Design a protein around this ligand. Structure first.
Ligand code: NAI
Ligand code: NAI
Ligand code: NAI
Lengths: 426, 426, 142
């Protein structure tokens, strides 16, 4: 209770502004009607501009605090499942037995994709990236689901939202199967969201696939820890896109393309250049490659994160779960003992302590995904798949607020009016 | 020029805010430091926030001004041609004949797309709305053009620009040929950008196609007039998605989706409901349907526009163009006598005079395209198809400035940290 | 001598000489050249084999693949003992090979295949099938 009263902006006279208050975190200065006077604020990146009022996820970087509907991330990441966490993000409260079962059911009964969609995978290249293809199928869904594009219809929005929570794993797994050359596997309504996923990823007609309970649980938690993460860029891309009235699918396709933006956006050799230098300087079994690689450090490798100050509150469970997994796959993961040296370096090497390169959720999530026999390429895909429920919730919460079309201003510093005279002939 | 120096914000401590100025338009209050000082504004819609610094387009909504690199949209549409405008937007200066030759030859040299991509069209249903197919195709390019995804390599941006700029009209005319069961047409180097698009759009293997010069220029004009339009919704989505590393092919796809969002996002029968009531109340040859239709008015119908007050500057050269097209096609447009009636209505109906539902560039474009034979399903594909350069330039500029990642704030107003206790048991 | 042949002759005449043992009379040359020309376009079903290979397959591998698949389609010229069968099996390969080679190239780069053209020479045609597109007229440098 300090400046919870008001404030005033002065250019050459006084302009009083409100100061709305949130139940958690920082309050804000109501500047909505500022434009109705010509006075604008400059802020590339909006890191000093509240883009909306939300209630889905609360974060406090320095304290390492992550919340989804108030429930601490560590509580959900252990005593719940992906669907129960999805129900919360989507509905604001933990489900009831009758609520959860009905939500769960509808999700499983819509796991198959139309046979004509499956055909589209076949026109993509085999050498393509499961993520580049994941984007292709996603933004292509609107061509089929023309019965749920109208964003101002709550019926449509829900159907669309369910079409995505059900179809993402199916879609994703197929990206993997097609990339390696194994036949696509249909969803089994008798398996849980995660088990059914590991089956579509690893099943083959040659024999029945049997999901390890610890591995199934481990994937559900990877999903849980990636469910949502507040107003980041890839979620703010969904919001911006949705404001115009763009269909859900194309919005969910935008986020995927924006979630791996830093992965390809690096360079053909950004975090891959020195990966080629593991053949000439391999005399040293660690500082060759990804111990020397990071000249331009990456948080995509599991070290560092803009959100939190000292650590990732999602990395807690992910690390414990990481041990159980490795403590199950035994004699196939002993070679992946670089996970602890890398972690050791991340905790003691100056270079890391300096830039605060702490192991985040993705650090451990990766060791598990790698431990499980999953190819690197399919890691942001799985993250984009898990993060979709969040993008769904955000997009949905924006569709109640008033669906405010992002129509920003610009500080124009270009040319003043000038006559045009073309001196060409072609 | 009163306070183009400084001003003060009063939250609790008088914070000095520097006022920044442009060369045209209004002044901006640099608040890029407030956040750190723990001060966040609240502007859902960024209606009072300047997202960036730009030197491409300048709009004076009240005075009906639209400038591309300092040149009035009128002169450009009357004196220039799409490709030169393409050159100007991206480069900031008009092209010398030699530079024009160079640029035109680069767009021409890359019009034919990969044949594998051509196989994507064949995975879509013949009954898929063309726009949906377009977003589908464009969202699938990254899989094939994996060598121009490093949003940070200058050379990669040049390729990603030229590709989109060259292949878009090619993918647009294929979305049309597909939806009607007619064979695709390959690009032709001897043809112009507009004339070629006309050829790819209409010609068949059965007869020699005649490219009417009147239609050729008209089409061209539609393109120059739809090139860019400042920081609107689609241009915002592109930038936001882009500031998050998203590859150029993904940004344009969300820009495309963001662009037709208001179309499908209305209702399966929003501006289509009364288009069904033209069989029961057809007793009156106008006020039945789309004279009585707009209970919920639309600028999609070609009336009015939030940006300009009294009129749309792009509609001036579009109206003139529309005059020759109709006077060229003659005995195939006499029935299309409603354009006049509709224009008269907008100019005189007290409601239209009242709420300013004046005809905009699209009213006059719709007529041109309608007279030309291009279906309404294609109108938006052609808007986005022209609008691509505007998205690329804005995308490019964003990457030269500093590519400030989109990380806005929120006013949290959900639960406080609460404990989770498995309500269910399944 | 290989020198004279390469400087004085042309592939097809050498084709004629190798197979026949003697140089061709103009009339025999006309006859032979017209037979190679007359069978350059391959079966469209065979053309559908290229589309079953990955766009990332090394061209040579695709070639061995295509050529090892011809027997299924040309089942009427497999009797290695029928003299007439050998004549067909010779002419086919001799005519369709450069056609399958230029298709292995167009394929590996995502460009449309080019049909043979009777007006073009054996080399000029292979050049045309190798490089031309439907977008512009191709100039065959002599
Ligand atoms: N709560 C609800 O009633 C919902 C209904 N829907 C409805 O679903 C219908 C089609 O949905 P999509 O699956 O997206 O159709 P789709 O056009 O993608 O086709 C998939 C087809 O497979 C069937 N399918 C999918 N998963 C299945 C499963 N596990 N067991 C049996 N059949 C399965 C679907 O019913 C449908 O016929 C729509 O008309 C929509 O209204 C979608 C979500 C929620
Ligand atoms: N300013 C520049 O130097 C640019 C160079 N490029 C380069 O050119 C290559 C072209 O790639 P894409 O066109 O996207 O290849 P693509 O394989 O994805 O699609 C078309 C293929 O057809 C050829 N092609 C396209 N339009 C043609 C036309 N009108 N006439 C004849 N051939 C045509 C292309 O060379 C290309 O191999 C790129 O890989 C890049 O290295 C691309 C853009 C600009
Ligand atoms: N010296 C001879 O008399 C020869 C006769 N043949 C006969 O000719 C037939 C040709 O069989 P393939 O060419 O292998 O048939 P195919 O069906 O396997 O492949 C091409 C088809 O296109 C036609 N074709 C190929 N190149 C052409 C061109 N440049 N212009 C017009 N049409 C063209 C062919 O007649 C044939 O039906 C054989 O079945 C055989 O009976 C084949 C070789 C030599």
């Amino acid at each position: 209770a300090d400046t919870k009263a008001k404030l005033t902006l002065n250019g050459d006279t006084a302009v009083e502004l409100d100061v709305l208050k949130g139940t958690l975190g920082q309050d804000v200065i109501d500047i909505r009607t500022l434009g109705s006077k010509g006075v604008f604020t400059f802020d590339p990146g909006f890191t000093s501009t509240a883009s909306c009022e939300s209630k889905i996820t609360f974060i406090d970087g320095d304290e390492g605090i992550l919340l989804h509907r108030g429930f601490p991330i560590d509580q959900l990441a252990t005593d719940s499942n992906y669907l129960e966490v999805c129900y919360i993000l989507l509905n604001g409260e933990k489900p009831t037995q009758e609520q959860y079962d009905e939500f769960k059911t509808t999700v499983t009964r819509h796991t198959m994709i139309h046979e004509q969609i499956t055909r589209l995978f076949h026109a993509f290249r085999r050498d393509s990236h499961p993520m580049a293809v994941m984007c292709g199928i996603t933004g292509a869904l609107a061509a089929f689901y023309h019965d749920s594009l109208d964003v101002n219809n709550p019926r449509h929005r829900e159907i669309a939202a369910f079409r995505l929570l059900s179809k993402m794993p199916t879609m994703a797994a197929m990206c993997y199967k097609y990339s390696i050359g194994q036949p696509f596997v249909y969803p089994r309504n008798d398996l849980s969201y995660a088990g059914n996923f590991l089956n579509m990823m690893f099943s083959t007609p040659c024999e029945p696939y049997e999901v390890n309970p610890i591995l199934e649980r481990a994937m559900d938690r990877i999903l849980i820890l990636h469910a949502d993460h507040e107003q980041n860029a890839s979620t703010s891309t969904v919001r911006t896109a949705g404001s115009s009235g763009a269909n859900p699918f194309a919005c969910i396709a935008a986020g995927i393309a924006s979630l791996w933006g830093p992965a390809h956006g690096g360079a053909n050799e950004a975090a891959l250049k020195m990966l080629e230098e593991i053949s000439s300087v391999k005399h040293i079994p660690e500082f060759f490659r990804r111990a020397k690689d990071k000249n331009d450090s990456f948080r995509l490798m599991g070290f560092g994160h803009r959100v939190y100050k000292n650590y990732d509150p999602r990395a807690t469970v992910m690390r414990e779960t990481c041990h159980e997994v490795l403590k199950e796959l035994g004699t196939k993961d002993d070679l992946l003992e670089v996970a602890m040296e890398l972690e050791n370096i991340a905790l003691n090497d100056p270079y890391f302590i300096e830039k605060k390169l702490y192991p985040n959720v993705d650090f451990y999530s990766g060791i598990i995904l790698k431990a499980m026999g999953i190819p690197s390429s399919m890691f942001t895909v799985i993250a984009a798949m898990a993060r979709t429920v969040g993008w769904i919730a955000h997009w949905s919460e924006m569709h109640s607020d008033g669906m405010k079309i992002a129509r920003p201003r610009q500080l124009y510093t270009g040319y003043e009016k000038r006559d045009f005279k073309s001196d060409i002939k072609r």
